[PDB]
Design a protein around this ligand. Structure first.
Ligand SMILES: OC[C@H]1O[C@@H](O[C@H]2[C@H](O)[C@@H](O)[C@H](O[C@H]3[C@H](O)[C@@H](O)[C@H](O)O[C@@H]3CO)O[C@@H]2CO)[C@H](O)[C@@H](O)[C@@H]1O
Ligand SMILES: [Cl-]
Ligand SMILES: [Cl-]
Ligand SMILES: [Cl-]
Length: 414
């Protein structure tokens, strides 16, 4: 018996770490688990070819935001039984439980595996040298912009690069997702889509959504984000933070683990950034504190010839011991509420900042058409960033771009 699992690159040697995690299950049940690692950039294509063809693994990792679209294709085995075995709805944060199904589906189709949410990593040495108090900078939008202003003024140079640091690094290349933009939209009192009047419609062009987006993109326009950063993607900016080029950058909890791994092992432990690392939550906007809350679930294809063994592997991967172990190896958070108490999470002060930020986590609605919506939003946001690269983003230019995105999103939501 060989069980097939597809996963994404959740740790530095992702297949080895997954193989170590399931070894006790393999021994107990007399099976080999065969793992395939898919890069995030292609995983959606490969999982959808599997859905449409009926040729694929037993289990796949799914980003939480993908569960609705794959569920709607009718290729996922119901897993209400597995979720009840793991303690049901009470065992999960609502933000996680909502990811277990297509919104308005009668059955669960994904088992929570791990959670992650976004916060700001910052250079403790750089904010000190600029006289920025992080408790002020990360409190409000006003604090944030004043902190970046001090950081632009600062005479600080990285000890390794002997060069200045960008106040804020954020990618300007057309993004794959709204994860970076979402907290700004939400903090202004906006949303990406809104349910009202028996339907979902775009809200990207609401006055609140546009205030949040404009506030965010205009930081770069004011010189707090260098031109070089506008020409990079998320991975490039992450490498730039590691390499000592950025004072502030937003990411998830995994960067804490990577900071304890040597560079030659896929981390940045030797680097000045690893030795001077802080974490602060997203600042409150005018309408409050929000961050993107996501993670990954596991799903079982209903064409699997190994559903019994696969359901036992889902209960194993979703249960307390494996929850702690995998989160320890990846730097993610457990999906199961009870596993957060482990001292490897609670006694880690940077991760404690992420745990506290989870109070303000916000998810996307689990819609069948979510990917279509997010893809039209990011195409138009990429045009917005291209105007920032000219210094020509106006409120009117942004509104016109979000009015076009909204027309297209509304047409897709019909
Ligand atoms: O949009 C799909 C899903 O995204 C999930 O976030 C992942 C990002 O898409 C992915 O780019 C990022 O990759 C990390 C990687 O885990 C890490 O090992 C490497 O060092 O850096 C990469 C970042 O450049 O991982 C995250 C977390 O898995 C969301 O969590 C999910 O909700 C969403 O559907
Ligand atoms: Cl963005
Ligand atoms: Cl939203
Ligand atoms: Cl990207």
């Amino acid at each position: 018996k060989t069980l097939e699992v597809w996963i994404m690159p959740n740790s530095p040697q992702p297949a080895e770490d997954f193989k170590a995690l399931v070894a006790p299950f393999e021994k107990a049940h007399g099976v080999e688990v065969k793992v395939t690692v898919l890069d995030w950039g292609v995983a959606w294509t490969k999982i959808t070819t599997a859905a449409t063809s009926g040729v694929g693994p037993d289990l796949t990792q799914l980003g939480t935001t993908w569960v609705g679209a794959i569920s709607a294709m009718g290729v996922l085995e119901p897993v209400d039984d597995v979720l009840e075995a793991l303690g049901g709805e009470k065992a999960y944060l609502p933000a996680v439980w909502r990811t277990t199904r297509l919104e308005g589906a009668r059955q669960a189709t994904a088992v929570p595996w791990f959670s992650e949410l976004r916060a700001f990593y910052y250079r403790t040495d750089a904010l000190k040298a600029a006289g920025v108090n992080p408790a002020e900078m990360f409190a409000s939008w006003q604090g944030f912009e004043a902190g970046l202003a001090r950081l632009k003024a600062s005479s600080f140079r990285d000890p390794e690069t002997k060069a200045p640091l960008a106040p804020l690094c954020t990618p300007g290349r057309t993004p794959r997702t709204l994860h970076n933009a979402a907290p700004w939209i939400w903090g202004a009192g906006g949303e990406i889509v809104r349910q009202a009047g028996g339907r979902w419609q775009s809200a990207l062009n609401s006055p609140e959504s546009l205030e949040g987006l404009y506030f965010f993109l205009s930081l770069a326009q004011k010189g707090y984000v260098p031109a070089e950063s506008l020409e990079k993607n998320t991975a490039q900016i992450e490498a730039d933070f590691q390499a000592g080029k950025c004072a502030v950058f937003a990411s998830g909890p995994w960067m804490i683990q990577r900071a304890q791994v040597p560079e030659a092992k896929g981390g940045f432990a030797e680097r000045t950034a690893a030795k001077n690392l802080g974490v602060a939550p997203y600042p409150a906007g005018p309408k409050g504190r929000y961050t993107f809350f996501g993670g990954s679930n596991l799903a079982l294809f209903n064409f699997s010839k190994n559903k019994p063994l696969a359901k036992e592997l889902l209960k194993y991967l979703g249960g307390p011991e494996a929850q702690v172990r995998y989160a320890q190896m990846t730097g993610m958070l457990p999906a199961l509420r009870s596993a957060w108490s482990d001292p490897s999470f609670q006694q880690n002060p940077l991760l404690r900042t992420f745990i506290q930020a989870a109070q303000f986590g916000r998810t996307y609605p689990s819609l069948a058409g979510w990917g279509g919506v997010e893809n039209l939003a990011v195409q138009h946001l990429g045009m917005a960033w291209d105007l920032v690269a000219q210094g020509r983003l106006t409120r009117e230019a942004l509104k016109d771009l979000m009015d076009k995105a909204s027309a297209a999103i509304n047409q897709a939501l019909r």
